[PDB]
Amino acid sequence: MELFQTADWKKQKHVPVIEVLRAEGGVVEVKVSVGKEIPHPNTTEHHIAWIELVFQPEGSKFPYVVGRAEFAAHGASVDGPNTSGVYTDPVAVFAFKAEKSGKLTAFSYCNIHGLWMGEATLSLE
Amino acid sequence: MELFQTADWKKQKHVPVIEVLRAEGGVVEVKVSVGKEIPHPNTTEHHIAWIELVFQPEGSKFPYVVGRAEFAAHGASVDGPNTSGVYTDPVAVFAFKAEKSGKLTAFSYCNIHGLWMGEATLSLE
Amino acid sequence: ELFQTADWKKQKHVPVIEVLRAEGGVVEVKVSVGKEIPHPNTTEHHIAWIELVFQPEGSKFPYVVGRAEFAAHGASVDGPNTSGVYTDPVAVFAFKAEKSGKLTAFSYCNIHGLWMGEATLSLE
Amino acid sequence: MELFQTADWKKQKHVPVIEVLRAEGGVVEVKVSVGKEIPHPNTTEHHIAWIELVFQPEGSKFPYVVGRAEFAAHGASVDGPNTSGVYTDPVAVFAFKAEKSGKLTAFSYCNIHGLWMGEATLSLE
Ligand SMILES: [Fe+3]
Ligand SMILES: [Fe+3]
Ligand SMILES: [Fe+3]
Ligand SMILES: [Fe+3]
């Protein structure tokens, strides 16, 4: 009974996609988004709420949470749902220092379609 | 008396700095960071824990939280403080649909130096 | 100012701070929005979070104690207000304090902006 | 494997413990804590950062996040680690409405001992 669903991100729009933008000299930038190939809805009633990034350096006994991004605006206003003109898209950039290569894991949440995860390898050298 | 401290970011390394990077297809990309000009420490004992971004479109009576970024790694491990080699930089990028100009406000928190605020204008026309 | 501190005629948004206990520095604080008169909780209108800050009397800086997010507002694949799961905007923060001082709570309504409440923590 | 470690909370104090305080007239209150019977340390260098509660109603294909509590103070101050006098206990109370019984899952995080989970049944009637 696994809560964190996984799939091919080219076929399933809910999967968080991890992209290593740079990993030069211990300086790391990692972009994570939901709906890269197929866009996910972002309305007052249906949206991605957050992405969390976890990094486990090779040989490390435990993983470390790198950070978490909340996407809080989804068009709600006093004029009703989907009227504010403000919608936060589910994409986040995490910049961090690291001394070793390791494993990246991302988790994301859709308010109606449950929890999701994805993985990538971080190579420094 | 205010909880939220403000200052010249050229002199003070705590003020969150707001940078509007791009605006295409109805989406705006806003980078927020602490320590852009003068790096704030990131140790187990002393670090920026999060940044939160708020946007109030012109003509809107209320502001909207766009999002929040937590910076969760600060070097802690079973081997002691500042030993994990993983340190999350206090920088975030928020992408959000916006249709109007208005005011951006960013809040940030240092675990020992209290709460901070920065402001900028989003100009769409 | 972004942080509103006074309620309207019919709608209460100001976070209410209650010190449940405080013996020997072992402290429990309940923060709520709309405990007497409920604030709406729908997909379209809800309190999203409460954050509690504490500044001990001698401290130059305040500390965040904690933050509670209220994440369920009834949305499901069957549509809004069909999940039957709705998180009330109430939190209990338990913490150690060695000194008296000032409590500040912040909260956010997704359509009614940002709010601030204040109370004193007295240990003796 | 899985990033979320589990165990008998009586033997492993990292495991989040779910206590259903009430579950009567649609009205549910649930206490979740780490270190219920055996306290987990709370120091600047080593502490529980957050707990997240998840609920999946019987017959619901997807789980829902009920809420998330962050425990942000760990004694840090301008005078050094473990000097502030302010430490947030990793205990949270989630009050929520439910229409059906189901499965509660809690997630928690220790800054040095990785990610943890616990489970409990919610019976309404
Ligand atoms: Fe979805
Ligand atoms: Fe600082
Ligand atoms: Fe409201
Ligand atoms: Fe631990």
Q: Which residues contact C72 (CB under 8 A, 6 or more apart)?
A: C83, C85, C86, C87, D55, D64, D65, D66, D67, D96
Query: Do the Cβ atoms of D63 and D57 come closer than 8 Å?
Result: no
Kindly tell me the burial class for residue A110, based on how many C-beta atoms sit within 10 Å of its own C-beta (0-12, 13-18, 19 or more): buried
Q: Which two tokens stand for residue B119?
A: 């402001």
What are the backbone angles phi and psi of residue A53, rounded to the nearest 5°? -115, 130
Domain ranges within chain D, ordered by starting residue: 1-125
Kindly tell me the burial class for residue C9, based on how many C-beta atoms sit within 10 Å of its own C-beta (0-12, 13-18, 19 or more): exposed
Tell me if C95 and D89 make a contact (CB, 8 A cut-off). yes
Kindly tell me the burial class for residue D57, based on how many C-beta atoms sit within 10 Å of its own C-beta (0-12, 13-18, 19 or more): buried
Give how far B75 is from chain D: nearest CA, Å.
9
**What's the CATH number of domain B1-125, 2.120.10.10, 2.60.40.730, 1.20.58.220, 3.40.50.300?**
2.60.40.730
Q: Which two tokens stand for residue D51?
A: 């707990």
* Resolution (Å units): 2.1
Those residues of chain C whose CB sits closer than 8 Å to some CB in chain B are 2, 48, 53, 60-64, 104, 108-114
Query: Do the Cβ atoms of B32 and B9 come closer than 8 Å?
Result: no
Most C CBs within 10 A among A46, A82, A113, hence the mutation to make, goes to A46
Most C CBs within 10 A among A44, A71, A74, A108, hence the mutation to make, goes to A44
- Which position has the token pair 């988004």? A33
Tell me if A45 and C75 make a contact (CB, 8 A cut-off). yes
**CATH class for the region spanning C1-124:** mainly beta
Note residues around ion ligand 2 (Cβ under 5 angstroms): B 110, 113
Query: Which residues in chain B are contacts of A87 at CB distance < 8 A?
Result: 96-97
Q: Is A43 helix (H, G, I), strand (E, B) or coil?
A: coil
- Which H or E run includes D50? strand D48-57
Query: Do the Cβ atoms of D102 and D56 come closer than 8 Å?
Result: yes
- Which H or E run includes C20? strand C16-23
d(CA B31, CA B53): 10
β-pairing verdict for D114-122 and C26-32:
unpaired
Q: Which ligand places an atom closest to the C-alpha of D39?
A: 4
Q: DSSP letter at A41?
A: P
Numbers of helices and strands, H then E, in chain D: 0, 9
What are the backbone angles phi and psi of residue A87, rounded to the nearest 5°? -135, 120
Q: What is the dihedral of CA A113, A29, D47, B34, to 10 degrees?
A: -110
Q: Which two tokens stand for residue C16?
A: 């209410």
Q: What angle do CA A91, A95, A99 make, to 5 degrees?
A: 140
Please name which of B88, D65, D60 lies closest in space to residue A50, comparing C-alpha atoms: D65
Q: Which two tokens stand for residue C112?
A: 């009614």
What DSSP assignment string belongs to D103-117? EEEEEEEETTTEEEE
- Which position has the token pair 């942000």? D72
Query: Do the Cβ atoms of C27 and C96 come closer than 8 Å?
Result: yes
Solved how? X-ray
Between the CA of D107 and the centroid of ligand 1 the distance, in Å, is: 22
Within a 10 A sphere around the Cβ of C22, how many other Cβ atoms? 16
Tell me if C110 and A46 make a contact (CB, 8 A cut-off). no
